């Protein structure tokens, strides 16, 4: 629903997601073959689901097709200043894709803003949602579209028949954390194919024993996992698949 | 400041609501103003939220399209039109101000309310 | 909806009252602020306190709010006669794409 909803949000208030508590798998991500630019940063794009972390943060806007190049760590420029800051120590992996045929439509959709004018500088990963006017001049205006006071919250252009590079491009970033805790959200060996009567080494969760995978006659309790022998040697494991 | 709001106001299963905000003084013509409605017996729930400046509608996914909201430069009002009208439509319409300010948090608090507009409808 | 809010409370005129608002990790966990309102039958509602850090100018100093993780919480010294109101914990809500107010606390005397 992150990625496939009916509308999605703006740059100064974007969507902010947490993932705890869940499995995934992230190889469904890149075979995908929709997806227009992918940079992942911080770790390979195809060893990341062996090594895991403590939390997931996602946060999902829209943004321009000249913009792409702004989400990176190391630049300045209007968006990436004003709006979401890209700290050194990011490790995070960009995601975006091109879906100009839902979120515009004729006439014009100007539906999502942006945040054109700041004060000064803002820490990362932190929201800005003031709709003060942005004082320029040395008088107060009250809140007037006079001299030296503009809004800082200006309107998209977001028209389907435009090009290549100005077209509403949905980009999503999935940041990792890395704290004093166990991990939660993980990727785990997925599932190999089953072979059975040959020589084999298998890791079922408690033991890496080399051998055979006979079909057995013998039905185990729904409790169990490993079985025992007289002999005090382990050669019954209750496959979990 | 202060706004004010209609009074009471009854209308048909199906047919079509028209009341107002008005703004005594100014603030008004800067900052968001959404529509926030409290029913006897649930919680509270929000339609959207409108910006006056750009005039740009921001509803939720939960409220189909069936309401409009407008905003006037001249007289500094708004006005909201609903039709279609349901049996659980019974409840109080509140016209809200929102404050935006900076931090970790960034959430859309409201800081001024309206007075209210009871609109009843039955049989 | 997605926030859950216990029916009543019973407290004592002299005593600390605390409230908690429950609800999931995308709209008050994800790292949202908190805003709570009370609701006044016969006026409107106002503003209380903003971000659980500032003070509003009109309101008293003897309600507390902070945010212990995923979950909120409101605590109050002294029961005065003025609080016969209902208690609503809001939220801005991702799934949602907006803000979604609380079920509701009743706290009022018998007498």
């Known amino acids: 629903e992150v990625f496939n909803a009916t509308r999605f949000a703006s740059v100064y208030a974007w969507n902010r997601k947490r993932i705890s508590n869940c499995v995934a798998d992230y190889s469904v991500l890149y075979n995908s073959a929709s997806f227009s630019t992918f940079k992942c940063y911080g770790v390979s794009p195809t060893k990341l689901n062996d090594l895991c972390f403590t939390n997931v943060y996602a946060d999902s806007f829209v943004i321009r097709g000249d913009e792409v190049r702004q989400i990176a760590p190391g630049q300045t420029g209007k968006i990436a200043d004003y709006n979401y800051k890209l700290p050194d120590d990011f490790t995070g992996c960009v995601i975006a894709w091109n879906s100009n045929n839902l979120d515009s439509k004729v006439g014009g959709n100007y539906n999502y803003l942006y945040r054109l004018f700041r004060k000064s500088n803002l820490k990362p990963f932190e929201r800005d949602i003031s709709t003060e006017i942005y004082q320029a001049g040395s008088t107060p205006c009250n809140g007037v579209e006079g001299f030296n006071c503009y809004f800082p919250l200006q309107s998209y252009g977001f028209q389907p028949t435009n090009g290549v590079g100005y077209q509403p491009y949905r980009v999503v970033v999935l940041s990792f954390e890395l704290l004093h805790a166990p991990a939660t959200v993980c990727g785990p060996k997925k599932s190999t194919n089953l072979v059975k009567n040959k020589c084999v080494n298998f890791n079922f969760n408690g033991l890496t024993g080399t051998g055979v995978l006979t079909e057995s006659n013998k039905k185990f309790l729904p409790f169990q996992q490993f079985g025992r022998d007289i002999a005090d040697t382990t050669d019954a494991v209750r496959d979990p698949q | 400041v202060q706004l004010v709001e209609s009074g009471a106001e009854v209308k048909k299963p199906g047919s079509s609501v028209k009341v107002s905000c008005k703004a005594s003084?100014?603030?008004?013509?800067?900052?968001?103003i959404s529509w926030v409605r409290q029913a006897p017996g649930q919680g509270l729930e929000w339609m959207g939220g409108?910006?006056?400046?750009?005039?740009?509608?921001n509803y939720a996914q939960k409220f189909q399209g069936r309401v409009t909201i407008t905003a006037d430069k001249s007289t500094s009002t708004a006005y909201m039109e609903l039709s279609s009208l349901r049996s659980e439509d019974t409840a109080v319409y509140y016209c809200?101000?929102?404050?935006?300010?900076?931090?970790?948090?960034?959430?859309?608090?409201?800081?001024?309310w309206g007075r209210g507009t009871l609109v009843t409808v039955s049989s | 909806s997605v926030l859950t809010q216990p029916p009543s409370v019973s407290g004592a005129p002299g005593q600390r009252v605390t409230i908690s608002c429950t609800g999931s990790?995308?709209?008050?966990?994800?790292?949202?602020?908190v805003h709570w309102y009370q609701q006044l039958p016969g006026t409107a509602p106002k503003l209380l306190i903003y971000?659980?850090?500032n003070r509003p100018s009109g309101v008293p100093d003897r309600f507390s709010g902070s945010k212990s993780g995923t979950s909120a919480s409101l605590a109050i010294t002294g029961l005065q006669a003025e609080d016969e109101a209902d208690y609503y914990c809001?939220?801005?809500?991702?799934?949602?794409?907006?803000?979604?107010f609380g079920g509701g606390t009743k706290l009022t005397v018998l007498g």
């Open positions: 809200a101000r929102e404050n935006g300010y900076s931090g970790y948090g960034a959430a859309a608090n409201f800081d001024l």
């Open positions: 003084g100014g603030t008004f013509s800067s900052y968001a």
């Open positions: 990790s995308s709209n008050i966990g994800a790292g949202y602020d």
């Open positions: 971000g659980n850090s």
């Open positions: 809001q939220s801005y809500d991702s799934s949602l794409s907006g803000s979604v």
């Open positions: 409108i910006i006056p400046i750009l005039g740009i509608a």
